[PDB]
């Protein structure tokens, strides 16, 4: 028997493999801000991917850096090759993109880089996070939320709530897809118990009461659309991370017990989430908003937490022993970490959107500070024609964008834009999602990499 | 944007990649004939994988050759990394194998070769299966005696053995019932998604485990003395059984084939009652009162299946929403599946005939062994010497072979419950494409293998 050469992919070969997957034409930059009813096109900004170092895994303090956002976007596209999508208007005239996404090549190229991508995306959780006795003590251990504060306190509550709702589109519109990955196969009575939870989310198979269909009504009632992924460029790093974590747990069955932990915790908190979400949306929108998606779990026992602990966790540790409980605990603790990152990232993004007029004015003192040599900042000189749309991304330090001539639409969130004319500009805050489009025949501008804009004031 | 290098994997690079996947220790030869409640070990015979040509895709006349068997075994193992299994006895003591099967490496190595394995396994269908409209499709759908399995089992020299061999062929499918179909309910698509989910719920007993259909088939197996741990009977799974099961994982994993699965689902539903009626009858005739056929008698009532729904609430809205251009794919799913069924019928009939003929083929060794000694045939011969316990895991050869035992004792295994004891001077004719293996029972065995091709030419 020939020796087994262990799987290995790193360095430049990994970079080339990531670029190879992502240069499929369906992943190239969009010429618009939105995907118009095409579930096969996802913007991965492949032109940047040759220049990222996938081998040095980031810690938590840098997981909102651009390389992390790029990897979350890559991973969502890789996981979703396993999901069935058709356009709302039907497949007609989109068959070419359909076959570019569902192809042997696109699957194999994505699956080859998936281990490296998952190390980059989730490796930081190793540093961030047993008997049956203490386990049942640990689970016994388990107020305005940060999201409520961000939305209710925003200078544009409806814009902030709409930005929040679209973060959930890939999760809620494909509701229970990652959980369904754990029902394939042949194992104990726990398998039918997992299946029961999936069935509830699918509305027992009645499409009108399928939970995804209810969230369609929620989106449409506040003037948003329900086609995936219309708002791809407005998905925060942290929202993709949260969604990706459950596909990670569901696809990789050595993490099955981590998912058992996460299922208990999410079911246990589902009612409080839906009540807060129902309350918040009615506050912001009034009678207009359809919150049926959430009010289907506003009764106190309208969840699966009690059965998750009794008929999933209990039989599994008995059949497989206490060696699995540290994984059950780890799934709970990892999910809680990701939730905190989401709260931080979302609140930061809303504050960044709300501050746009002040940050346009702050361009002036920051620019003057550069003249005075307060910061020795690298400069980039760019010239771009009309319609050259920079798909949304972020930078890892603060940047100053200064318009020499022309007109730029500076995009900072859904419904959040600035028109920058000659002599104007904007302070771009580190890790904030933003993009730009050129709305004059030509635009000449500069990007100064100031690091920390406060040193220029 | 850098230029896109199209995915490419062929020749020696592909051979090395298949070897690299398959040399994971959980895939090495078993020292016994059975896997003993360990669902992470699958025998891929990796030592022979360097010497197969994965680039030349066989046609139908050659899809029971050994390379096709080896690819079916690989593909089953690749697909099943997506399925959850735990040992019946629990995970304690099997954690290392558990993590060897569910690892980033094992998945990534298998997924890299999956395109090439699927071309090898399924490419012949392009030739076996040749614009449409909504009710030219309805005319075609409307257009769709002892069954081959009924004849194979009830015509057998050993009815019970033939039926047990048949039942174990279904273990990977029935014990993971509806797993490939579940692959189609992930995502976000129209009303068809919830109609598909209905069918999945129905084969999983609606989340009640004792009513769940895999548990019913567990009771079938145990009622005739077989076990229901996966994959206990791996070495007795025929090429065609794996091929049929893999075809649905293929359709399920690769959503460009979604409409083929829509067709296949209709055809299997509208065939299910006939199949279950015949299975229930033949098992009762073979085993009597002892056999539990509830798994089958769940579906012995005419029109109590999902076929009408699949036509009305799945096929009809998808054709309206996505256009008539998907109809050739719906038909192709039906026609490709029917080809695979024909192959299964032949392969299983051949295997049972081969098990039943073991006494005669042991005697046929004598006129064939001498026929070679008569200048008659110029057949290559390998001289093999092997120690005790050298269990050759089951495989097949592409031509007839004569096995002659110079000295020692060999257990020659031709099927579940089908064995020969071969001693000095004795031997057996090994028929092309038939599944078999051997174990050395003395502590040394000297024997010879003559590639006679067609043993007829030595008579």
Swiss-Prot record, chain B:
Stable and active at pH 3-8, but loses its activity above pH 9. Shows reduced activity in phosphate buffer at pH 4-6. GO terms for molecular function: metal ion binding; monooxygenase activity. Pathway: Antibiotic biosynthesis. Fe(2+) 3 binds at residues 395, 397, 436. Keywords: Antibiotic biosynthesis, Iron, Metal-binding, Monooxygenase, Oxidoreductase. Involved in the biosynthesis of the glucosamine-nitrosourea antibiotic streptozotocin (SZN). Catalyzes a complex multi-step reaction: the overall reaction is an oxidative rearrangement of the guanidine group of N(omega)-methyl-L-arginine (L-NMA), generating an N-nitrosourea product. SznF first hydroxylates L-NMA to form N(delta)-hydroxy-N(omega)-methyl-L-arginine (L-HMA), which is further hydroxylated to give N(delta)-hydroxy-N(omega)-hydroxy-N(omega)-methyl-L-arginine (L-DHMA). This is Nitrosourea synthase. It comes from Streptomyces achromogenes subsp. streptozoticus. The lineage of its organism: Bacteria, Bacillati, Actinomycetota, Actinomycetes, Kitasatosporales.
């Amino acid at each position: 028997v020939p020796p087994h050469v262990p799987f290995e992919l790193s360095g430049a070969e990994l970079r080339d493999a990531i670029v190879q997957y992502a240069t499929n034409p369906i992943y190239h930059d969009n010429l618009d801000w939105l995907n118009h009813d095409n579930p096969y096109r996802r913007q991965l900004r492949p032109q940047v991917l040759p220049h990222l170092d996938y081998d040095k895994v980031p810690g938590r303090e840098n997981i909102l850096n651009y390389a992390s956002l790029a990897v979350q976007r890559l991973l969502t596209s890789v996981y979703e090759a396993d999901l069935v999508f058709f356009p709302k208007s039907g497949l007609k005239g989109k068959e070419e993109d359909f076959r570019a996404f569902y192809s042997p090549a696109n699957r194999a190229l994505g699956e080859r880089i998936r281990p490296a991508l998952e190390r980059y995306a989730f490796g930081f959780l190793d540093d961030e996070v047993w008997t049956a006795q203490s386990l049942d003590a640990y689970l016994d251990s388990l107020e305005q939320s940060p999201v409520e504060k961000a939305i209710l306190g925003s200078a544009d509550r409806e814009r902030a709530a709409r930005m929040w709702l679209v973060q959930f589109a890939p999760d809620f519109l494909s509701e229970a897809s990652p959980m369904m990955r754990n029902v394939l196969g042949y194992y104990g009575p726990a398998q039918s118990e997992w299946f029961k939870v999936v069935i509830d989310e699918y509305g027992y198979g009645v499409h009108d009461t399928k939970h995804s269909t209810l969230f369609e009504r929620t989106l449409e009632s506040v003037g948003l659309e329900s086609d995936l992924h219309r708002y791809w460029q407005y998905y925060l790093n942290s929202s993709l991370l949260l969604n990706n974590y459950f596909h990670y747990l569901g696809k990789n069955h050595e993490l099955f017990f981590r998912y058992v932990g996460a299922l208990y915790y999410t079911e246990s908190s589902l009612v409080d989430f839906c009540r807060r979400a129902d309350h918040l949306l009615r506050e912001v929108f009034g009678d207009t908003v359809d919150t049926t998606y959430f009010t289907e779990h506003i009764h106190i026992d309208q969840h699966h937490g009690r059965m998750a602990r009794e008929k999933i966790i209990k039989p599994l540790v008995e059949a497989h022993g206490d060696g699995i409980i540290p994984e059950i605990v780890r799934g709970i603790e990892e999910y809680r970490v990701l939730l905190e990152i989401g709260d931080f990232d979302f609140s930061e993004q809303i504050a960044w959107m709300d501050a746009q007029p002040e940050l346009k004015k702050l361009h002036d003192p920051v620019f003057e500070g550069l003249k005075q040599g307060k910061v020795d900042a690298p400069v980039a000189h760019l010239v771009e024609p009309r319609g050259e749309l920079s798909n949304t991304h972020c930078h890892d330090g603060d940047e100053l964008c200064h318009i020499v001539s022309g007109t730029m639409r500076f995009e900072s969130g859904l419904g959040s834009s600035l028109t920058l004319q000659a002599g104007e500009g904007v302070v771009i805050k580190r890790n904030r999602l933003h993009g730009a489009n050129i709305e004059s025949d030509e635009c000449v501008y500069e990007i100064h990499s100031v690091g920390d804009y406060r040193k220029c004031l």
